[PDB]
Amino acid sequence: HDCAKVDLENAELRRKLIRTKRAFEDTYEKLRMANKAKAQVEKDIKNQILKTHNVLRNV
Amino acid sequence: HDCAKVDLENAELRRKLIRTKRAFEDTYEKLRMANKAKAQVEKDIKNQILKTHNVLRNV
Ligand SMILES: [Zn+2]
């Protein structure tokens, strides 16, 4: 048994295990931001139609 | 340290690392097939946006 190496390996595994989770969280939020972005798009076009309609109402 | 406890923790760290990797693999594979299903819809949407983009060319 290598007491120095096993403590070092556990520190390496724990450190990297944390690196892995935070990478996913970033991705999760990134996907979360992307989906909400395309959600807005459907409403933006609907909004644009209303404006254009209101513009042509003024006649 | 505690050689018995640290080795058991080391086995736990590797174990948890395997679950995360398999969790990613599960997600990736599920996502890979899922994207292929929605892919026809996505190109159709891209075309209408592109078409509408082309419509606004009039100046
Ligand atoms: Zn030891």
Author numbering:
A (entry chain A), B (entry chain B): 1082 to 1140
Reported in the publication:
SEC-MALS analysis revealed that LZ formed a stable homo-tetramer in solution, while CM2 behaved as a stable homo-dimer. Intriguingly, although CM2 showed no tendency to tetramerise in solution, apo-CM2 crystals contained two copies of the CM2 homo-dimer that interacted in an anti-parallel fashion to form a homo-tetramer. A splayed C terminus was also observed in crystals of CM2 alone, indicating it is a feature of the CM2 sequence rather than being driven by the interaction with the LZ. Zn2+ was not included in our protein preparations, so it must have been incorporated into the dimer in the bacteria and then retained throughout the purification process, indicating tight binding. Addition of EDTA to WT CM2, or mutation of the Zn2+-coordinating His and Cys residues to Ala (CM2-HCAA), prevented dimerization in vitro, confirming that Zn2+ plays a structural role within CM2. The HCAA mutation perturbed Cnn-scaffold assembly in vivo, although not to the same extent as deleting the entire CM2 domain, suggesting that Zn2+ binding enhances scaffold assembly in vivo but is not essential.
